[model samples]
Target chain A: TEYKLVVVGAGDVGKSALTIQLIQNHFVDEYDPTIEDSYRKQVVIDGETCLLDILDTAGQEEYSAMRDQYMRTGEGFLCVFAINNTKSFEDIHHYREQIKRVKDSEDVPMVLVGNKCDLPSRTVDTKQAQDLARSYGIPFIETSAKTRQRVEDAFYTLVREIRQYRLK
Target chain B: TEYKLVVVGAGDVGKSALTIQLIQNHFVDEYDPTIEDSYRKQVVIDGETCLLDILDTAGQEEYSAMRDQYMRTGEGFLCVFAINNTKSFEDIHHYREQIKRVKDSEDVPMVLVGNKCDLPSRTVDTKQAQDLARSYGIPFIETSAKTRQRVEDAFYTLVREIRQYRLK
Candidate 1:
């Protein structure tokens, strides 16, 4: 089986951090446009092996125009937001709304991720994020890309979500 | 506006406790078949005044035969289970699966509730229930009918979920 997962959020929400940490297992200090945003990894989840094609939507200039195209093809989404940035958290609504609109389905597979949990100063409370994810009827996870905390689980959970969605 | 909500689960999962608590503002000590299974309440959720017609499917002998009928008409559902009973927690899958099948849609508004949180011993871990709800792409909440903790949030969350589903 194969899963096409997309990491989406506003600027500087660690979209690349989570993706690179999953694929490379190390954190990058700065955004490098030269690095490839799309990556693939094969792994076993729940005893089933599958290929994960991950798309890190960072530094994509035509995002507004190309969003519908990618949203149409992506099987599942990792909607990321920084824990310390309130505006980034609020911006998630647009990305999620657009994905549903493009896919024309209300039950699209998704995972709500609160990234940058390693930071000391936080603006978004964990309960606040949990409540938002609850309202959207999706899973919520807190991850620190810098610390490599729950980074793999974030992506793996999205794949599991896609599996459940397809079975329905 | 009015929402037709249904409470479903295996036998003895506090389907009546949560419902009567919302409608009557108190908990019922015992399940009485003589009492009306259906209830109505008017409340403001997020500033919207709406009537909630709740159907408590407790002590309904013909649940298997009549499930499809109610599942079809229910705008949203509260899939309740007891935190102290592992079997009741496992039985939630059947009810949820049946609802999706009968509704012929995967995006049906529903909440995964763990009732009887007031009990001293808990067999169902909070994380386990949260993970299950995450997998199902629905909200999960723990409620104490006797203490009335988060009992109202469970029902109101389902209403909000229904509204979001309708908006999409």
Candidate 2:
């Protein structure tokens, strides 16, 4: 089944970069700032190619005004943050709560992403983010938009979770 | 003059935290997921006490429809993002441009705020954020709603800028 994955996070956790990298395979070095763009990709998850529709969301403060729509559309979520910023790390809770509020599920198919792993100084440490992920009952992964590290892995994981959850 | 400062940025960037911390001297331990809220505080900037009215904005998708009204209300703006989240950093442009468009001014009295400095992994570095501030011709400062670090500086700078620009 085609799964819809929504990318949600505070501004600049590389939500757009990760979304573009997943569908396009190249990093747009400069930040254009997303305003809710969607893309579709035939992604292989669990040895099967499935249609993945990605909702690339805007992390701008004003964009949050329409968050319910974005939350309602996706089957899964890539709730992201930059590892070096604890606030972005903290912001993941807000996304998870919103998703829960919109979809009314605690066990939603979601991934906690710490993006920009390629950077030298890491502020939001893996352990802390991992613990938060554990508390939220979600899987945690880190990726770099510049190097494309684990970008696909993060997306595929969400799609698989969506599939598994759907089957259950 | 009494100043109206509108805090605009993506969700989880600590806009509410900043506003509340400034007015109440407390940190909100959890993200409750806010809609739009307005606050008022009597602040002493440069030894001059003034009544400051702060409009704390919601950073969700559906709220973008009401952005024009929010953009049009403020005298100065606190365009904020999490220091760790590059997406929030890039999103400042959208707020700035929107402010410019609504207010119809090239030199808007604004401050580029990189919040959540109290966190660990640093993603959007001080230099990068500073450069963005320079390019935008606005003052930049890093703040933390939790630690209450530089929170006052950000607002004071914007108020001073508004003072200077309005005097012209």
Candidate 3:
């Protein structure tokens, strides 16, 4: 199956980092804000060949107007947040709410991703993150784009969510 | 497996109707507000014998304080809304949000039910109700407690959701 996945989060939460890590297998050293970038990879997940079209979204406020269009088109979402930034963690609610609002479906396929797990100082508790994701009825995974930790699982889990969603 | 299920919704949305229909296989003709009621039943679902402990809650404002405790203990919820009442339909959000809040998990097992389907006039559009339930990532079913339409399925589906939730 071909999955249309969108990576969304507050600015500087490493939406691009995770996406780049998944698609290119490397971490980005610079902290440049994304405008928007799309990448496609054909991967084998669970013994099935699947095509993934991933959209890495801009976290800047200037691009806020463009969110609804992509949100409507995207099949699933990766609601990323940085573990070191409490504000970024709080901002996840807005992104998730907006995705459901624009998609007009409360049951949209999504994953709560806490990125930058490699950071030593963490403001967000892992238990709190798990609870929040549980409240949204979605899976939560802690990942470090810098270390390439679980970068692939983050995207692959979303594809699995989309697959289950389609069956329902 | 055993399931602890709670029925919640706005006042007069037929919390008792659905529960009674499922438990006694009969329709209620008179309307009486419930403070709280619990019933137990054992039945076969998908060839598995399951015990269901259902809690029917009072929808009035005076009983609002009691919600948190039940929301926390219940394994799954039936968020019922009367199809003929628009206000009841709108109140579903609060119940769902509060359930997740008290449970401290967004991924609670739930089924969005549009009851009173026997009524000829429906202010809540089927499509709109469907979209709302989908957004919550739960199954939606339209039923008539009076006619006993899909009453069993609503509760059974929630049990299924709980099963899937536990596996995850």
Candidate 4:
């Protein structure tokens, strides 16, 4: 897999969750095997050898320098947040500038995922998340791994979007 | 690593994100990580060797069978929910049951984290989330990863509670 797609963020934002789906084609509850930073794998999008690398970065701001390196290294990126958590939403400002610092260019064809869409009734508004992603020039999606709502579409759309954008 | 303390939720409740803080020791933008599993090292109060395996489970429920298995494995459990999203909040039922089965009447000692506490202006009510957590017998915490608000305390309290129960 030469196409490196790194996922960084606060723990448990479905970075690993999304990686599993894209790799093993399954889901598991949150488990901490060891407390050290590590990685896992999956053959995403036809196993076309895009080199899918899911980097689980630290959440503390102290690791900003290292995390920035990860952010800069990725060819494409996804900004994930919980559907109902506004703090995670608020952290977007921090997330955006960090990614921009590394990845640069507002036309990165990235997508913002408001995860946990299964809980729409308890959501913080699709518009709220959309506005941010839209303002940032990235498309938005409300996804859930529970109801299977827009789950596949989120990643599939990203890959397709990246593929389309790269072609241009 | 025995004494595995796992967090089970539909998705985006801060599993990997929490682990990111617990180990990598920092926060980044919410990401769609390419890899699914991570391991970190830690020496807890107990002399015995214990590994904190933070499993980043998928948010999609289509493969709940897999998610249930991970839930069962957590010796100590944290059932997280977003205060704003009702769908994820509602799934606490299915998630809790899975924990009960995996942990086996161990009281698994869970804490219901209402993540994203920084956005009080647009957040779901504290009283409402508190009531739900009370019904489940797990304490509730509203956290903000951005402000580092109550983020550490939420887990620290859970560990304190779980360990106290273990001592008994």
Candidate 5:
């Protein structure tokens, strides 16, 4: 796989659905976790024909051993949160800098996904994502893995950007 | 039944909204002052009528005197999380153990609730939940409690499990 998508957070479904929607191009209302600790899914981009291995970290605030594992390899990141959760959204801004501190990737393609665009009523705010994305210079996508809304475009957009950025 | 439920966690809508959902099988949608640290409501489950007394505690990341108080007597523990918050889900690591340590029952049945499951795109990754639930040896269910999706079934399911253990 040429691209590795490392979704760094504990929450499971959003990250899993995003992969399924983007890669498999299938959407299920819910995702049953196939395993524990970390989840991995590999997808081969169609046009690019490149393999992408996606790593989803476990959420639930139990990052004791997981932290040590993350440092071994370097990959692109897609930080995500539900639009309705301010604290979860805030976590992006808080941890983005920490992410910067850890790795040696100068041009890491970090994408912030504000999922659940379907629920307009429960949104915490999108401005936070936008503002943080701007400050970080990473692209932000408002996506929904349920309806597969903006799902395909989000992944390709990320892959496209990362590819071009990496080549430069 | 005087006190109907005990919702454990940090001071936020996670507990309050879930409590309100427990009270009425629908999302509170908007935040209201009704959200509290602890709440009680009467609900009939499996033809048995009883008050679901909810004790919603703080995140309890650090030590607290009240942690013991809540854990000591919390009969039914619903570890709740905003389908989006990694930290909320992460709270399970320490909090779940705290529940077991303080809980009078050595082998109490628990319900690992990924609240707000209706919004699959807004969920914390599922592995965190599946892993912890496995460790705790309990059942895990996802729900919005606001939309009332699977909320009733989840509560009653755990209630049934608790009752079965007592009977055995």
Candidate 6:
């Protein structure tokens, strides 16, 4: 079975970097530039083979109306925030809320990601992101798209949840 | 009294166009292609003379953390979004929330501006912008840097609010 995943959050929070790395170690800035960007990959979770269709979204406010289309079609979401950017961390609310509203489900298969971990000075603490995840009853993971750290883990976690939801 | 004003919003939301139009009566696609740009102007509002120092910010997520300094030093902010781009419109919430958080006040002196009004097609309607502004209890106005519509009003409105805050 093929699963659909959408990567979203404030723009430049490494959406392109993360998606490019997952879609196989290549980054093309213009390909993912603007409103909506999509990528494809295949992954195995717990012995099940599934194709991952990833849609990387532009986090600008102008795409508010199109969020419904993205959320409705997506089986899973990776809501990313840059750890060095406090504002992006705070915007997790907007992302989570919009998905919940569009999907009309409280238990959405989503992960709270803190990206840009390679940066020296960070404003959003890992513990804080985890705490937020706990409060929202969601999973939290930190990844550095720049260093390719935990990039696979973040995507794998979300897809695993999507698989579980499919089983149910 | 002199006041510091900052223009912040999503990239390509006309921050540069708006700023340049006001400062030099000219329009350019990219203003201060660098990380930060500043301009100063003198204006009289309600018979009160003041010098306005405007800082136009890059809305890219990489610059997200630097917003605190801009917000802290700025007495007022022009939170801009492109009406034709719904994603840009959605980013207004992020800008407003950050300013409020950095300023540590629920009521920050700011204006929600819908730029590129001269465009024939607008994804964000006036009612939606006005409603969001109402929810925040701040002023909302539309402008087009290309046509120079409401360019001065947006900045002037924010500075006036700053003066009110400074007086209080």
RMSD, candidate 2, Å: 13.9
Candidate 1 residue-wise lDDT, B13-47, digit = tens: 88766776675642223344664544322444554
Cα lDDT tens digits for candidate 1, A25-101: 42223344664444323444444443333333333221112345567767788998999999989888988998999
The digit string of per-residue lDDT tens for model 3 on A1-168 reads: 446667778878887667655645422222334522232224444444433322333311221123355677678888989999999898889888888888888799999999999999999999999999999999999999888888888888888998899899
lDDT of 5 by residue, B1-168 (tens): 211234565445356566555555422233335644243233555655444434444322121123454455455667777767777787766667777767645686678888877665665777878887888788888877567787777778777766766677
Interface Cα RMSD for all candidates?
Answer: 21.1, 11.4, 23.3, 11.5, 17.6, 15.7
Q: Cα miss at B155, model 2 (Å)? A: 32
**Regions of candidate 3 where Cα sits further than 4 Å from its true position:** A25-65, B1-168
- lDDT ranking of the models: 1, 3, 6, 2, 4, 5
Which of candidates 3 and 5 reaches a greater DockQ? 5
Question: Which 10-residue window of candidate 5 chain A scores lowest in summed lDDT?
Answer: A59-68
Off by over 4 Å in 2: A25-65, B1-168
Q: Which parts of model 5 have CA positions greater than 4 angstroms off?
A: A10-13, A26-42, A49-64, B1-168
Every candidate's DockQ is 0.01, 0.03, 0.01, 0.03, 0.02, 0.03
TM-score of model 5 (CA atoms): 0.42
The sequence of per-residue lDDT tens digits that candidate 2 reaches over residues A58-161 is 31233122346557656788888998787788777877887899988777899989999999888888899889888878889989989879988998788778
Worst-scoring 10-residue span by lDDT in model 4 chain A: A59-68
Q: What is the lDDT of residue B46 in candidate 3?
A: 49
Position A165, candidate 3: lDDT = 92
Q: Which stretches of candidate 4 lie over 4 Å from their true place?
A: A1-168, B1-3, B25-40, B43-50, B55-66, B120-123
Candidate with better DockQ, 4 vs 6: 4
TM-score of chain A of 4: 0.75
Comparing only chain B with the true structure, the TM-scores of all models are 0.81, 0.80, 0.80, 0.72, 0.73, 0.79
Q: How close to the true structure is residue B62 of candidate 1, measured as C-alpha lDDT?
A: 19
lDDT of 6: 0.71
